[PDB]
């Protein structure tokens, strides 16, 4: 089962992501922090990250320039959910904006996460 790590601090927005990437089943992991986000990923192996770069106490950008710097973590594909130019060149492979498009959405995480190895 892939599993997905969900970086956002609005429990809204949260349950939301959570809620349609369970359907289409996958494992979630979830935290509301930066910092807490590069731990969990090194300690659980995520497929994606799903980073909201508007974070309240750092950017989710600087958050994906460490991700890049860890020879373990570099690998995984970072969607950043914005509220396209800086996203795509802080090392982000895609990005939603909100109000988010589900089928968009959805679209966007399947097509990074199922491709042939
Ligand atoms: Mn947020
Ligand atoms: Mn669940």
Same mark, same amino acid.
């Given at each position: 089962?892939?599993?997905?790590? #969900?970086?956002?601090?609005? /429990?809204?927005?949260?349950? !939301?992501?959570?809620? @349609?990437?369970?359907? *289409?089943? %996958?494992?979630? !992991? *979830?935290?509301?922090?930066? @910092?807490?986000?590069?731990?969990?990923?090194?300690?659980?192996?995520?497929?994606?990250?799903?980073?909201?770069?508007?974070?309240? /106490?750092?950017?989710?950008?600087?958050?994906?320039?460490?991700?890049?710097?860890?020879?373990? !973590?570099?690998?995984?594909?970072? $969607?950043? $959910?914005?509220?396209?130019?800086? #996203?795509?060149?802080?090392?982000?492979?895609? %990005?939603?904006?909100?109000?988010?498009?589900? $089928?968009?959405?959805?679209?966007? #995480?399947?097509?990074?996460?199922?491709? *042939?190895?």
């Amino acid at each position: 089962t892939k599993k997905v790590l #969900i970086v956002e601090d609005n /429990e809204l927005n949260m349950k !939301l992501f959570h809620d @349609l990437l369970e359907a *289409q089943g %996958y494992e979630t !992991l *979830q935290t509301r922090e930066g @910092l807490s986000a590069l731990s969990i990923a090194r300690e659980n192996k995520p497929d994606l990250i799903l980073m909201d770069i508007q974070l309240p /106490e750092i950017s989710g950008l600087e958050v994906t320039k460490w991700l890049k710097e860890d020879d373990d !973590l570099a690998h995984i594909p970072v $969607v950043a $959910v914005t509220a396209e130019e800086r #996203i795509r060149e802080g090392g982000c492979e895609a %990005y939603i904006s909100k109000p988010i498009s589900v $089928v968009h959405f959805l679209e966007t #995480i399947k097509r990074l996460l199922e491709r *042939q190895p």
